[PDB]
Design a protein around this nucleic acid. Structure first.
Ligand SMILES: [Mg+2]
Ligand SMILES: [Mg+2]
Ligand SMILES: [Mg+2]
Ligand SMILES: [Mg+2]
Ligand SMILES: [Mg+2]
Ligand SMILES: [Mg+2]
Ligand SMILES: [Mg+2]
Ligand SMILES: [Mg+2]
Ligand SMILES: [Mg+2]
Ligand SMILES: [Mg+2]
Ligand SMILES: [Mg+2]
Ligand SMILES: [Mg+2]
Ligand SMILES: [Mg+2]
Ligand SMILES: [Mg+2]
Ligand SMILES: [Mg+2]
Ligand SMILES: [Mg+2]
Ligand SMILES: [Mg+2]
Ligand SMILES: [Mg+2]
Ligand SMILES: [Mg+2]
Ligand SMILES: [Mg+2]
Ligand SMILES: [Mg+2]
Ligand SMILES: [Mg+2]
Ligand SMILES: [Mg+2]
Ligand SMILES: [Mg+2]
Ligand SMILES: [Mg+2]
Ligand SMILES: [Mg+2]
Ligand SMILES: [Mg+2]
Ligand SMILES: [Mg+2]
Ligand SMILES: [Mg+2]
Ligand SMILES: [Mg+2]
Ligand SMILES: [Mg+2]
Ligand SMILES: [Mg+2]
Ligand SMILES: [Mg+2]
Ligand SMILES: [Mg+2]
Ligand SMILES: [Mg+2]
Ligand SMILES: [Mg+2]
Ligand SMILES: [Mg+2]
Ligand SMILES: [Mg+2]
Ligand SMILES: [Mg+2]
Ligand SMILES: [Mg+2]
Ligand SMILES: [Mg+2]
Ligand SMILES: [Mg+2]
Ligand SMILES: [Mg+2]
Lengths: 262, 205, 151, 64
RNA sequence: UACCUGGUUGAUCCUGCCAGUAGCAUAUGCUUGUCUCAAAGAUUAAGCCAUGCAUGUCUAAGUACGCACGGCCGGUACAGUGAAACUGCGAAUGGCUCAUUAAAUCAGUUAUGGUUCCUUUGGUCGCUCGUACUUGGAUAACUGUGGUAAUUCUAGAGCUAAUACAUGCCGACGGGCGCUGACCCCCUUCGCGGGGGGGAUGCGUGCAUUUAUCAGUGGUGACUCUAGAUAACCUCGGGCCGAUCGCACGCCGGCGGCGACGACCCAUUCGAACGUCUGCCCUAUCAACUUUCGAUGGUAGUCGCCGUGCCUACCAUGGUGACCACGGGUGACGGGGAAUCAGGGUUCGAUUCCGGAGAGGGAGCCUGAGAAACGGCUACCACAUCCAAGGAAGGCAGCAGGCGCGCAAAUU
RNA sequence: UAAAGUUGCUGCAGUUAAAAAGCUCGUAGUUGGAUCUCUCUCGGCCGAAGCGUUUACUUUGAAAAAAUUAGAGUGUUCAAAGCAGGCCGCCUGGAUACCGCAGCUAGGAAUAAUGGAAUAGGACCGCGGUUCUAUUUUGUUG
RNA sequence: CGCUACUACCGAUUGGAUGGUUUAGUGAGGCCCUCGGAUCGGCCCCGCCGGGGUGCCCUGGCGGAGCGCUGA
């Protein structure tokens, strides 16, 4: 295939979008942006499939062209804009704010946040490099580069960004005992305290994480996102508090809710 | 056209490989820039990604560095005297990387005579026409003369470079790629490398 | 051992060998400084590479190569090329219909540095993946271990 | 490419021996007693029961 | 549902095949009331194609002197709607088909510390000591003369635009920093001499580029990494350092808020391209193959976006094989998968998802971030259209549709 | 395709039904007899470091497209399907399993290969030497 | 041995037809290099000159010529 591809088959779209099979052949094909194609949520999917504010794609376009949607404090009129982890979506006309946080089953949940909490976000740091007359530079998972960071900030750390200004306010160092979320793999969406990190030089590093219920699970280092310092998260967690129920206890909970209903 | 693919080649076992696609644009090659010595002629090539390669066809000036003295100057390229790959390259006077070249020594002599206040590459007739007598002897304050005298204690050139300076032409190695950057830069040969290439050149003739 | 056997002058590019020297510091030769690097992954630099004089641009310790990716092991089978050898890797391939294995092998041409002397047909070599060095060579010998009955 | 689904199943299976007195009599008894249209309905019910029995047999061999 | 039954004998028990039995796919025959899904010119011919359609695109914001409409006022340069044309972007996606292709493709796993990357997103964009209250020449649309049998052919003439082509400042700007060092001062030393300062005048200066040298902010398992210092360079077929548009309008005589375009470089996204490891059907009535025209490796280079015999020169004689090399065949595109199946297996996978290849057969290119592109171009080979015989124009393995081939497949 | 245990790995046959080379040697291949019951340093008792010869094997963990398959929920009027739906603005899904082989990961040490001293070309303790070398010296300089 | 049919082989014929590989020679077309220079400009020079200062040159706008100098 000469040149880049511009379409996305519906059955070839990422499964966490929860797209059906009979609506069409194609999928929204996220635009290039701060988040990778497989790990993002396009604006149209969120605005139409998730929130049901629009019934068709044309209605999503009509919504976005009145400049009502803001992603991390900036008006975004692109309906296929890739909104990813920890992004803040603000709709002032109706007055709500959402944070894209993975659910326990590895899907972007509709998570409403208070307007006070919509003024900042947390970003994982991807690399630090010195350039241009010895000025340090940070690169985050959100593709934003910040010059003059705190010298203590190292790779795999987490920084709190004020969305209005774009500057760092504080940070969490990657260390055992700090709370984290898994942003990829089998344990995606799970929240727990880092227990141990084993280093394999020349290969991937494995991080062990223990839930609040005592369950343990491993991931790769690139799949770990520091959420809070110690046991306390710096953001609000979704309704499922990051713990994964087995199918048996999920069925028991569903049956109990059914019995208590009515 | 010209191709740089690996599939037209035999396998390591010696068997033939049957091509599974026709020639692709990203495997192309281009004719060589057999850079000559002459008045500057450089052509630009639009290459992959929209960037630019400078294809030097004729060159007569280079940027050469005297490493022991850290003196880099723009000099005139005179002749090609050795090529480790082919002899026809010396015969046709082609400037490629690692080719041994004769460069004019005038800027280096000027820098030496201005920095050390000692003559370099001069005959015994001792002409020393004005503005060179001044640059070599002059009149200076006690501090300046003391600084120059301090310099003179560690200003001794190897005999081979002194002979070359007497002749007016130095041996240099081209460290750049004229067919890719359009520039013939390099360094003045000295030390054991100079001895090696002098022996090789003498044995070649 | 003379190291100037090619038409061109052999020299470690990083080292500068024409530094000006005063006659007061002319005790024979300056003992030309040697460039060497420590390849990671817990591999020791051979003392030969540090104290040697060979020029090998494909040497993992004194040349311009980066060890990355896969680290494998083999047995030396042939040493008839210049600075490169042929090793043999043997393995068993499983066949599921019969629940049984079959013995297979494949040869690999790997670059051998002059820092590994007294390499015999039969010893074990730990090689590491690098960028293509030739048409068929993609590995560099990182460690040599003698055979089980050497002298 | 289209926006259609092609998942489909056969709800019955056919007996291997087409003519045998006992099977024919038993199927006719079922048809008459439950007012069925043909033998395909009997085979459909037989197939659902067979799938259920296969699933149960798979589960039994597992650990309790 | 882990299943058998008929047939050799005068009769018996075996071996053993033939036949029966069930499913699944293609075709075909007879038959057919309702309703929901739903495959469909793959097989033979990657054979040939009439005709029509399948890729175009304008916002408040690049260029409007078409009355083509419409003014409001009529000198208010330009109201607005706006065909056309210039400019920009896309046309490299999608769709089709399965001819080629046998460690190739492809799959899983890794690498780029060996490269390119339009766009989106973030950073950077007075860091450089050197007409501007705005520069120049065209050209199209349009108006007029045309030529040819003929095309989405174009020529001559007359105007006129730019975010098309070019050209080119001011300012920040005071300096700082390297070098230079006329001179001047202090100090010690009788003194000499030594030590320490201030300095006029000259050259250079930022980020990109090319080379050489020096020291050792942040990073990696590992850089010859990142940053720093120095001497220079910096392509006339030139590198960045805004001569651009819109909307609100303001304050104190100059300063300004939102945007939109553009831009070197870095990062990011989308990739792509080479590599690593393991894995493929039949065939020995293919047992040795490659190497004189690169086969395997070394040194230096050329070319390439880069690592590499990729190519060249000089060297060495290597490299693969009964663990099946090399050669041949395939009714072979590879997978995810499909049919059948107690358990193990056998067979199928042209076919809607992923990857590859091709656009009648080869080859060569332009433009572009991205084609060796064919609903782009240039040739040759095979077909074939119009012709006034001078010439011109082709490519349905896109959607319909026709011919042909066939056992075999739908509406211009 | 099953029937075909008539291709036989599971799992067939070779005295007479088709079938063991005329006989022996012999390279590759395949197979191969008993036997052997973690610590010294670093950082805050642990976290670190090796290396126990290396594995094969077994168990775990990670990474592994969706569709399809298995399978949870859900009265499409039922069903094949679909991913929907339920209650009087709320409530709730869009699970889970499986994914050879090869490649990563951490436990086990039966089985099976492989080695560890027999010219001592041995282990451990101390010794002594030989050589080169990094820094202590040391407000500072020196 | 005789009667009929089918299949297959050897095939004299020095078989053809189709295809595919090459030796040698020729070689379209593109691309690169070295030239080439039909034309179109700009500077200059004058006849021509608008005005500034003042006849007085710093810039408009022409025609003529210069293998003048250069660019495309
Ligand atoms: Mg395509
Ligand atoms: Mg790595
Ligand atoms: Mg570029
Ligand atoms: Mg008989
Ligand atoms: Mg009978
Ligand atoms: Mg039968
Ligand atoms: Mg029947
Ligand atoms: Mg009806
Ligand atoms: Mg079709
Ligand atoms: Mg066909
Ligand atoms: Mg246009
Ligand atoms: Mg665009
Ligand atoms: Mg384009
Ligand atoms: Mg930007
Ligand atoms: Mg005109
Ligand atoms: Mg090379
Ligand atoms: Mg080579
Ligand atoms: Mg050669
Ligand atoms: Mg085929
Ligand atoms: Mg197949
Ligand atoms: Mg197929
Ligand atoms: Mg076919
Ligand atoms: Mg496809
Ligand atoms: Mg193509
Ligand atoms: Mg055709
Ligand atoms: Mg083509
Ligand atoms: Mg077409
Ligand atoms: Mg096309
Ligand atoms: Mg058609
Ligand atoms: Mg017919
Ligand atoms: Mg049919
Ligand atoms: Mg069968
Ligand atoms: Mg059976
Ligand atoms: Mg039998
Ligand atoms: Mg017998
Ligand atoms: Mg016998
Ligand atoms: Mg044997
Ligand atoms: Mg035993
Ligand atoms: Mg799957
Ligand atoms: Mg199902
Ligand atoms: Mg595995
Ligand atoms: Mg020829
Ligand atoms: Mg030609």
């Amino acid at each position: 295939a000469r040149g880049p591809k511009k379409h996305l088959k519906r059955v070839a779209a990422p499964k966490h979008w929860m797209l059906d099979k009979l609506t069409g052949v194609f999928a929204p094909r996220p635009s290039t942006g701060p988040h990778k194609l497989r790990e993002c949520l396009p604006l149209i999917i969120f605005l139409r499939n998730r929130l049901k504010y629009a019934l068709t794609g044309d209605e999503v376009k009509k919504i976005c062209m009145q400049r009502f949607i803001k992603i991390d404090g900036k008006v975004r009129t692109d309906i296929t804009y890739p909104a990813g982890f920890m992004d803040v979506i603000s709709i002032d006309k109706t007055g709500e704010n959402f944070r894209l946080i993975y659910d326990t089953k590895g899907r972007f949940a509709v998570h409403r946040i208070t307007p006070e909490e919509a003024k900042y976000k947390l970003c994982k740091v991807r690399k630090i490099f010195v350039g241009t007359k010895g000025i340090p530079h940070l690169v985050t998972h959100d593709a934003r580069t910040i010059r003059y960071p705190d010298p203590l900030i190292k790779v795999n750390d987490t920084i709190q960004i004020d969305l209005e200004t774009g500057k760092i306010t504080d940070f969490i160092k990657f260390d055992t005992g700090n709370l984290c979320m898994v942003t990829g793999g089998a344990n995606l969406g799970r929240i727990g305290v880092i227990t141990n990190r084993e280093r394999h030089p020349g290969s991937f590093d494995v991080v062990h994480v223990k839930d609040a219920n005592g369950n343990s699970f491993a991931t790769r280092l690139s799949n770990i996102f520091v959420i809070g310092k110690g046991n306390k998260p710096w953001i609000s967690l979704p309704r499922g508090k990051g713990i994964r129920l087995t199918i048996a206890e999920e069925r028991d909970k569903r049956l109990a809710a059914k019995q208590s209903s009515g | 056209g010209i191709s740089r693919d690996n599939w037209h080649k035999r396998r390591k076992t010696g068997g033939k490989r049957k091509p599974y696609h026709k020639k692709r644009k990203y495997e192309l090659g281009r004719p060589a820039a057999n850079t000559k010595i002459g008045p500057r002629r450089i052509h630009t090539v639009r290459v992959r990604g929209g960037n630019k390669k400078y294809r030097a066809l004729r060159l007569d000036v280079g940027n050469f560095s005297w490493g022991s003295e850290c003196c880099t100057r723009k000099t005139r390229i005179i002749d090609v005297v050795y090529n480790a790959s082919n002899n026809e390259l010396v015969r046709t006077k082609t400037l490629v990387k690692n080719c041994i070249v004769l460069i004019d020594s005038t800027p280096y002599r000027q820098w030496y005579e201005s920095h050390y206040a000692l003559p370099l590459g001069r005959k015994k007739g001792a002409k020393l026409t004005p503005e060179e007598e001044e640059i070599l002897n002059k009149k200076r304050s006690k501090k300046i003369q003391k600084k120059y005298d301090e310099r003179k204690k560690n200003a001794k050139i190897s005999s081979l470079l002194e002979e070359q300076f007497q002749q007016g032409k130095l041996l240099a190695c081209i460290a750049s790629r004229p067919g890719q950057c359009g520039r013939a830069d390099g360094y003045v040969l000295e030390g054991k490398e100079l001895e090696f290439y002098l022996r090789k050149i003498k044995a070649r003739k | 051992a003379d190291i100037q056997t090619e038409r061109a002058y052999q020299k470690q590019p990083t080292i500068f060998q024409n530094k000006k020297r005063v006659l007061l510091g002319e005790t024979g030769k300056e003992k030309l400084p040697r460039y060497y690097k420590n390849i990671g992954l817990g591999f020791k630099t051979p003392k030969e590479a540090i104290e040697g004089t060979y020029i090998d641009k494909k040497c993992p310790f004194t040349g311009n190569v980066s060890i990355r990716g896969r680290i494998l092991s083999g047995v030396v089978t042939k040493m008839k090329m210049q600075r490169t050898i042929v090793i043999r890797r043997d393995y068993l391939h499983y066949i599921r219909k019969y629940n049984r294995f079959e013995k297979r092998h494949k040869n690999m041409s790997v670059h051998l540095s002059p820092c590994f002397r007294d390499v015999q047909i039969g010893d074990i070599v730990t090689v590491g993946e690098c960028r293509p060095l030739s048409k068929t060579v993609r590995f560099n010998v990182l460690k040599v271990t003698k055979a089980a009955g050497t002298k | 490419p289209v926006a259609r689904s092609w998942v489909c199943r056969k709800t019955y299976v056919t007996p291997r021996r087409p003519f045998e007195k006992s099977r024919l009599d038993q199927e006719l008894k079922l048809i008459g007693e439950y007012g069925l249209r043909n033998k395909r309905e009997v085979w459909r019910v037989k197939f659902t029961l067979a799938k259920i029995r296969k699933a149960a047999r798979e589960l039994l061999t597992l650990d309790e």
